[PDB]
Amino acid sequence: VLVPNLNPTPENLEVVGDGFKITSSINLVGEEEADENAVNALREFLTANNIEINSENDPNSTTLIIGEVDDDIPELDEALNGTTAENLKEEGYALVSNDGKIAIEGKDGDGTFYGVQTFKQLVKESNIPEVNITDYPTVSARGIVEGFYGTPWTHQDRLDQIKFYGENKLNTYIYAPKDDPYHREKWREPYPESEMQRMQELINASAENKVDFVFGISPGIDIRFDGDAGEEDFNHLITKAESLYDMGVRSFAIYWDDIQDKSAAKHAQVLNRFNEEFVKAKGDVKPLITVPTEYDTGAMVSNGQPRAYTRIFAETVDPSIEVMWTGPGVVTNEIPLSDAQLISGIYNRNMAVWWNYPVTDYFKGKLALGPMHGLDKGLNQYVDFFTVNPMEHAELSKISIHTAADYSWNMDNYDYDKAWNRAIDMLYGDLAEDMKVFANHSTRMDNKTWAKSGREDAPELRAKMDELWNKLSSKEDASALIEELYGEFARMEEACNNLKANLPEVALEECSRQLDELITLAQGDKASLDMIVAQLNEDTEAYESAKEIAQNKLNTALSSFAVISEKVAQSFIQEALSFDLTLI
Numbered sequence: 148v149l150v151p152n153l154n155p156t157p158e159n160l161e162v163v164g165d166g167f168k169i170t171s172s173i174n175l176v177g178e179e180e181a182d183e184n185a186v187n188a189l190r191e192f193l194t195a196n197n198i199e200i201n202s203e204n205d206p207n208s209t210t211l212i213i214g215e216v217d218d219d220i221p222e223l224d225e226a227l228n229g230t231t232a233e234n235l236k237e238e239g240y241a242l243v244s245n246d247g248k249i250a251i252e253g254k255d256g257d258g259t260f261y262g263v264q265t266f267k268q269l270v271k272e273s274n275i276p277e278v279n280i281t282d283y284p285t286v287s288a289r290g291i292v293e294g295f296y297g298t299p300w301t302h303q304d305r306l307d308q309i310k311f312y313g314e315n316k317l318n319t320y321i322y323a324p325k326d327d328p329y330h331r332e333k334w335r336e337p338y339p340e341s342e343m344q345r346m347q348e349l350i351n352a353s354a355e356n357k358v359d360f361v362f363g364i365s366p367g368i369d370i371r372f373d374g375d376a377g378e379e380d381f382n383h384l385i386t387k388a389e390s391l392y393d394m395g396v397r398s399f400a401i402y403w404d405d406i407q408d409k410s411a412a413k414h415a416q417v418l419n420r421f422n423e424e425f426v427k428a429k430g431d432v433k434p435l436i437t438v439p440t441e442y443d444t445g446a447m448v449s450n451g452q453p454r455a456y457t458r459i460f461a462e463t464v465d466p467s468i469e470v471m472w473t474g475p476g477v478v479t480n481e482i483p484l485s486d487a488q489l490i491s492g493i494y495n496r497n498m499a500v501w502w503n504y505p506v507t508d509y510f511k512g513k514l515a516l517g518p519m520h521g522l523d524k525g526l527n528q529y530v531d532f533f534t535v536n537p538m539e540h541a542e543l544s545k546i547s548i549h550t551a552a553d554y555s556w557n558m559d560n561y562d563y564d565k566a567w568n569r570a571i572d573m574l575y576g577d578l579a580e581d582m583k584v585f586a587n588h589s590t591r592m593d594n595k596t597w598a599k600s601g602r603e604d605a606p607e608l609r610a611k612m613d614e615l616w617n618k619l620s621s622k623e624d625a626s627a628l629i630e631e632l633y634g635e636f637a638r639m640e641e642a643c644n645n646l647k648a649n650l651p652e653v654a655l656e657e658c659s660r661q662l663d664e665l666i667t668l669a670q671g672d673k674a675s676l677d678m679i680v681a682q683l684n685e686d687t688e689a690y691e692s693a694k695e696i697a698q699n700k701l702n703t704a705l706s707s708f709a710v711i712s713e714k715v716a717q718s719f720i721q722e723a724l725s726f727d728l729t730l731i
């Protein structure tokens with residue numbers, strides 16, 4: 148039995164046997180000791196898969212042994228056969244499946260939860276490969292920052308995301324929706340009881356899935372620093388955090404991104420005192436997180452030094468506080484190692500990243516369905532906290548989010564093309580190949596001004612198109628390539644028609660306009676080829692009809708709100724329109 152697709156990619160995986168079939172009922176050893184959340188996740192799986200737990204041990208049944216390094220379970224030590232989570236970093240685990248026994252040992256509880264996650268990905272129709280795995284993340288915090296503008300996620304969207312994060316070993320969710328005044332416009336005041344159950348449902352869902360629910364506060368709207376409105380407003384900040392602490396919040400983020408009010412020393416004072424009086428006082432609270440007013444390299448540095456704010460902020464903030472930045476720009480092609488080194492150097496600490504992809508709020512007509520791209524594979528040298536800013540489109544965000552889980556857990560081995568393919572395969576099953584056709588055309592984000600990021604759209608198709616123009620302007624035979632391109636354009640329309648018919652409403656409601664748009668472009672792309680063949684056949688009537696169709700298909704794509712494949716399927720039409728074979 149083969150190893151299924153896994154996400155994230157485990158650090159170490161060795162195929163050690165032929166694989167075995169899990170029995171209809173199993174022996175469960177260790178559930179009394181092992182991490183509750185981890186056991187609950189196992190039980191949920193076993194139920195959904197029709198695998199019963201024996202009330203009494205039967206040596207003919209499959210044995211599943213679960214626990215932590217701390218625990219003393221001899222059945223665990225036996226089944227692991229020398230493999231252990233003892234030497235592993237936090238969230239690490241060991242997984243051994245060999246000859247009727249599956250053994251999960253976490254370095255800690257989060258770790259046993261993640262082991263279960265790998266187990267659930269390993270098992271297909273009762274069959275499991277025989278493997279030994281030791282696994283642990285590259286980066287210590289890995290998650291989503293809910294920082295996009297436009298229509299907020301629904302409550303159900305959120306619950307589903309949290310469960311999705313847990314399944315793919317993402318441990319951070321920074322909560323900050325624009326339709327929640329208690330994070331900004333009413334930052335001072337605690338949640339009323341009418342909003343309590345909703346917030347409780349998020350806190351509990353997060354805790355169950357080993358996701359740190361980070362509560363992001365943006366006081367900058369109207370926060371006062373100076374004098375006694377300032378001792379007032381700082382105490383309001385404590386009051387709020389205390390009312391959230393009582394609900395179960397153990398992680399906090401304070402934003403200075405939108406304030407116009409701009410004093411590094413004042414922002415950092417609030418942060419430091421909050422840190423001493425709250426986060427250190429509670430003992431229970433994770434390191435404080437902040438977003439400075441200058442949060443991209445262009446805004447932070449000028450002329451080979453930091454700008455005023457950044458120098459003062461870096462000098463004043465406690466070393467234990469987590470500082471976010473977006474890379475070399477707000478939305479940018481890359482975070483090269485050199486940029487992380489620079490910023491990390493200025494702050495004399497490991498940085499946190501806020502990565503603005505797949506967010507599309509700055510160019511909402513296009514969907515960002517690409518992988519993590521442009522992020523240095525050695526980034527962990529200067530960064531120990533990684534978040535992505537997703538789209539308002541929760542369901543379709545899962546594709547790039549899937550790749551972020553792999554990038555941040557197994558950075559050194561991250562392969563953007565393979566990770567992209569794995570995301571669509573795992574998310575879309577039988578609809579995967581059709582989803583690839585469409586999503587391949589919608590990875591590159593570019594608002595034509597300040598914001599651009601992402602793998603280029605449909606690169607292989609781009610290259611074939613370029614080859615066509617090259618052959619045709621070189622008096623070379625392009626017969627076979629013309630045939631091949633007709634096939635690609637027909638395949639584009641076919642895949643989109645399939646997705647329209649078979650995608651669930653939850654995806655379809657996010658992408659239906661972009662599906663129609665790629666159909667229109669595929670049809671304009673076909674017409675474009677018809678122009679070429681017409682010229683080759685010296686059929687002016689066929690040329691003129693195809694030209695009129697191609698121009699129409701281009702014009703509708705340009706007018707529509709939806710945007711896709713600008714540099715490829717769209718641009719090909721304009722290229723064909725302007726091309727004239729008779730001059731070669």
Ligand SMILES: C[As](C)(=O)[O-]
Pocket residue numbers: 294295296477478503506508509536
């Ligand atoms: C600052 As933004 C990338 O959420 O528009």
Ligand SMILES: C[As](C)(=O)[O-]
Pocket residue numbers: 602
């Ligand atoms: C084609 As590339 C190395 O910019 O992903």
Ligand SMILES: C[As](C)(=O)[O-]
Pocket residue numbers: 694724725726727
């Ligand atoms: C570029 As033409 C042949 O439509 O004038």
Ligand SMILES: [Ca+2]
Pocket residue numbers: 180181182214215217218
């Ligand atoms: Ca335990």
Ligand SMILES: [Ca+2]
Pocket residue numbers: 512703704705706707708709710
């Ligand atoms: Ca358009």
Ligand code: NA
Pocket residue numbers: 678723724725726727
């Ligand atoms: Na033409």
